[PDB]
Amino acid sequence: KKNSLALSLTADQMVSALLDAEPPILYSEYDPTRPFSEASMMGLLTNLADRELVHMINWAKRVPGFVDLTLHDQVHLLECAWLEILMIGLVWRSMEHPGKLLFAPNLLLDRNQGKCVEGMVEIFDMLLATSSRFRMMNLQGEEFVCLKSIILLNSGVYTFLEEKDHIHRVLDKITDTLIHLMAKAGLTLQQQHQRLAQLLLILSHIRHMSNKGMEHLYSMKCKNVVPLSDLLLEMLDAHR
């Protein structure tokens, strides 16, 4: 679309819209009767991700420029980016907890907890390494919502063309906002384009974690470890 509000927004209006669209932090189930096992662990994680998906969908609709896309294109981007989006949010809220992943306020796991599930420790290390990287960079909240919106718009824009140009036009606006945030923060012009690069390079590793995670989530389905919601089933079927 050419009448998109995303293109008409300033950098400060872009930040404000993204901050007000932020999904809520949800709690995990706390059933003490279940043992500490692979089936109960994956059941806790599956249930949390299921509920987070419903709030992500509302968040995506409040991302500037997303409502301008077709329903089919909107479906494509969410199906492609949903695990990336859950992962970067987990990495963001795990920043205040070094060496641990804050899945939920009542569920703070460390590297060891996932060892009852094959391959989970390896992915936990990658998620922990990303969290420590965001901490070392002193990632700000305004930068977080920009990066997460970039994930939503970019991750699937090449696997589906005026709508292609609309997404790239909105992505260019989010680039402007990121620069404006760093300039307003007082970084030099050289530090600005370097930090932009560092943040965008981390998105490749988030994609890498999502691709490996999706492969495991699919084998989990094919092993009947836990029941999967019908929405999560359609999210996985999109990747295979």
Partner: peptide
């Protein structure tokens, strides 16, 4: 398609 109706609501 569950993702369809969740987007319209």
């Amino acid at each position: 398609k569950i993702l369809h109706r969740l987007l319209q609501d």
